[PDB]
From Swiss-Prot, chains A, B:
GO terms for biological process: negative regulation of DNA-templated transcription. Copper-sensitive repressor that has a key role in copper homeostasis. It is part of the cso operon involved in the cellular response to increasing concentrations of copper inside the bacterium, which can be highly toxic. In the presence of copper, CsoR fully dissociates from the promoter in the cso operon, leading to the transcription of its genes. The chain holds residues 4 to 88 of 119 of the full protein. It comes from the Bacteria. This is Copper-sensing transcriptional repressor CsoR.
Length: 85, 85
């Protein structure tokens, strides 16, 4: 069943797929380079926001409750690739 | 009519919209946070590549042929917002 944050991330993502459609569309109509470039940047910024809600969800959620057991090093170590790999 | 670079940017973008679908889908199935986070990052990296092909197209294209006339300052000045605004 679906979190606070995971819902919003999801809706954010849905919103971004439509944003993407628009860009695909204008590129298809041989749109002005700079305009396309700025849409693409708008999309990336929304992606950044969604990813950080994710992280945030993850930390209080799966991350924390690597309280009990092997948690610790493994949760961290793999958390690290998802920041940049 | 459609450029070298603008074609590829377009196909890249089309590819990314499908990538996005997948993410929307897994989030809908309450997917593992980290996995989702890493897809989202994969999408952003492809966006970065597409944007730079754009830039590259723009520079040889509309940017350059602000050779003649008021070109110069205006093309540059507005080019600058599309790097970060
Ligand atoms: Cu998680
Ligand atoms: Cu251009």
């Amino acid at each position: 069943e679906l979190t606070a944050k995971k819902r919003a991330a999801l809706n954010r993502l849905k919103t971004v797929r439509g944003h993407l459609d628009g860009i695909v569309r204008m590129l298809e109509s041989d749109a002005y380079c700079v305009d396309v470039m700025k849409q693409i940047s708008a999309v990336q910024s929304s992606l950044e926001r969604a990813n950080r809600v994710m992280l945030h969800n993850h930390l209080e959620t799966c991350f924390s409750t690597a309280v009990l057991d092997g948690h610790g090093q493994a949760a961290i170590e793999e958390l690290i690739d998802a920041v940049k790999f």
